[model samples]
Target: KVSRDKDGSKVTTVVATPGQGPDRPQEVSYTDTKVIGNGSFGVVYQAKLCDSGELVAIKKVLQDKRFKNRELQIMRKLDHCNIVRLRYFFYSSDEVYLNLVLDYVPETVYRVARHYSRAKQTLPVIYVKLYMYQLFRSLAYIHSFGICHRDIKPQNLLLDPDTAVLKLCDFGSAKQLVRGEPNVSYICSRYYRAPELIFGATDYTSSIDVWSAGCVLAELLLGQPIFPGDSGVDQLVEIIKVLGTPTREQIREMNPNYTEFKFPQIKAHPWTKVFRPRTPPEAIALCSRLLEYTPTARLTPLEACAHSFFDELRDPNVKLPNGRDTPALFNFTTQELSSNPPLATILIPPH
Candidate 1:
């Protein structure tokens, strides 16, 4: 493989030893690190670069029979501040190894939450908000480039415990939202999947990311999945309970493909009939805008970024760790979570 320098000069890879294979220098390899996490499609390892000695995260994409090269091509060209960076890659006869030179985020806030039993300490609100904003910015950029991140969630967002900066990781499920296309059908994680996908809306748009972003925002706040439904119908129920039932006209406007599917008119459930937001209305409003059932009706990431809820805490000077150092993990009490009217609290570090 060849890599271009910052000056737009193409540099070819070099083989081992004295000038045999054009020896442009082999990409740094670190196969000695331990496997940290493994998923259906790939495995992530904590490795150290042989040349720089800097700790890095390496992801090896498996050689699946169903894998698509187009997806890899999309990932290779992606360049975003919030998105993860691909340093270099090497492939053998069997599988392709992707060297993701990413900022190390050892512990996810979700792990911290489970450890603390969902108690609301700091809950990393500022960190999460900043991260979400960056994620939106990244999605906006991706859409601008005609791509869409079909999957988005807290698990996909990585945070460096040392730097506390959030990085958007994983693009295996990413695909191009080809302009003028009628539709593309793919099922992502059920919890964050958009309503359009559930209702058979195949025409892809940037709104898919917006829906997922809303779910991520809610998950960040609740310390658990906001809508942990098992099926599409259940997911829709959870959504409508919070955002209220969507109008048929709205759905038709957003998705012309809706006519292909059978959608029954459903009655709107009372907002009070379901779980209420333990936090302020500002948070709920933002979440509702993003969680709109109609893809075309959902708030654009840019619009969500400018929502008033973010204004309450948008000060760039908001005192929080810029890097790793768990400032204050949210530790919600069982009573708080179980209560009909849940209580949330923030823990402060001792002076």
Candidate 2:
């Protein structure tokens, strides 16, 4: 399918040549270093380019056939400062493989968080804010492309704990919305799933991702999954318990499926509110905007980036110009930390 850019330049589509898209890169051509993570759809491995010595994360599709085509199509179109980069790919008839030659990042905090025993499970506060800004910027770019990253969680966000750069990765369940359809069926990782998905809103917008971002930000600050619910009902109850039940009219407006499901009625706890960078009131205001039951009213990722919270964080006084004031947040420079397992770069504007 050929498409045109904003500049009115026409570009031809690159179709898979016959016997292309490998499930794995040729073992002789590249050396497999280690396994990163695995999902139901595929396994991710670290591989090295034999000629240039460049390192990359290679994802091998194991279960489903459509994983490579869909993910490659989406990843190829993605170009943003805060998003992960996809270098090259290999495709074939039965199985499709990808050479996601990205700058290496250290093990994500998701894996690091697990290493913490129950007693040692606290994340540094400054890093939490730093991560929030990074992910927010990435979400803003993703939404600008008219795509919703259905799955968002600490697991999906790769962090370079050293450099303090956090990137959004793992677009396995991402979906592009069509013109008028309001309900989408491919809900991502159940834990990070938004309220609209539970209510059966198919033709949803980018707001669903913002909600998941809120959940992830909260987890980063709290050092644990904020809404650790067991199921859809449990997740809703957890949300309602913190933010109060949405009015029937509000629920109906955002979710047409409200009548079919059972919603609980309970007094809300202020602690469950969205935690903006500053105080409770600030968090409440921003969280209220993002956590709306109605999809249309929810804040867009770009708007969220411009919110007072992020604006404040961008200020030199609020956050250090060089991040040195907060060692925990800005300890490693991007150059020093690029080779780590979790790829992250410090935001340094040229003077």
Candidate 3:
């Protein structure tokens, strides 16, 4: 709860624990509380710490004592530059409310892309490379721990307009996938949904996140959603338009249970014609590798980072539109490089 202090400022005090490190309870005080965002999950409040003057987002959700909050569990385990950082967590009023304090980032990729679309211009190629490269880095980190950010879309990608830093957020739909464990297919947003999810596959893998990232890349290039489907079945119709009908073997690769191969025999559309005439060939080549009909055929997050489309990011002279040096892109942790050692050489170009 919030209250007005004698100095005419709103203040809130709570018993909270640090998001990382040992679990020791402490009293934290923050002032200037105001709601910044809200959705089906819960509400987020923007506040400032009284002691440090640091801005933070307090996400308040209803607490359920019966089960552990998966988002909280996963965020505690993740520590990467491209992923949002959790600062602290607390409970209030006999445990009716669960509050998660996270680092405050003022902008989102969704809004940034829309700003470019409003002016009828595509987001700069350099920004796209910078944004998507960080996304893959975050995915590589999370996927290494078997965590699948089921909801991968532009909205979940947080951005700082000034620094050009992008971070992946909104882990409410994320999960640590285990072999033989069935997960819901209706997870991701519509435009970014994977073909395997549309085919009703429950035993999916982290590769689905790769498909979503591909759609995000395509949307940024096209200045709109690439698939733009209205419903579940209609979504497949849109996919078939570009990818053509999936073969029986390809269908089996996606689901493996249904043996129905009754799609119109339309040929695959050339990737070159999918975007504007001046779109880069390297970008189209990368899209084809990520948006394959077969689930396993899609590029892994690290592989996507190593693609030619991101070669510009490795250049020593690359700079943002404001002439500022690009954010750190090649600082890979040992765990991130552990999955694929050879890619390290390709990922970091020499000065």
Candidates in order, TM-scores: namely: 0.73, 0.74, 0.96
Model 2: per-residue lDDT, tens digit, 319-342?
A: 444444422322323332332314
**Alpha-carbon runs more than 4 Å astray in model 1:** 1-25, 63-68, 93-103, 120-124, 182-184, 259-278, 312-316, 321-351
In TM-score terms, which candidate is top?
3
lDDT of 1 by residue, 117-218 (tens): 445443655655666666765675576666777888777777665555556777767877766665555466889988777777677686888989888777
Model 2 regions more than 4 Å off = 1-29, 62-68, 92-101, 112-121, 257-259, 272-284, 317-351
The lDDT of each candidate is 0.61, 0.61, 0.90
- Please list the residue runs of candidate 3 whose C-alpha ends up more than 4 Å from where it truly belongs after superposition: 1-6, 259-263
Better of 2 and 3 by TM-score: 3
Using TM-score as the measure, what is the rank order of every candidate, best first? 3, 2, 1
Worst 10 residues of 1 by lDDT: 339-348
Question: How well does model 2 score by local distance difference test?
Answer: 0.61
Clashing residue pairs in candidate 3 (N, C-alpha, C atoms within 3 angstroms): none
TM-score of 2: 0.74
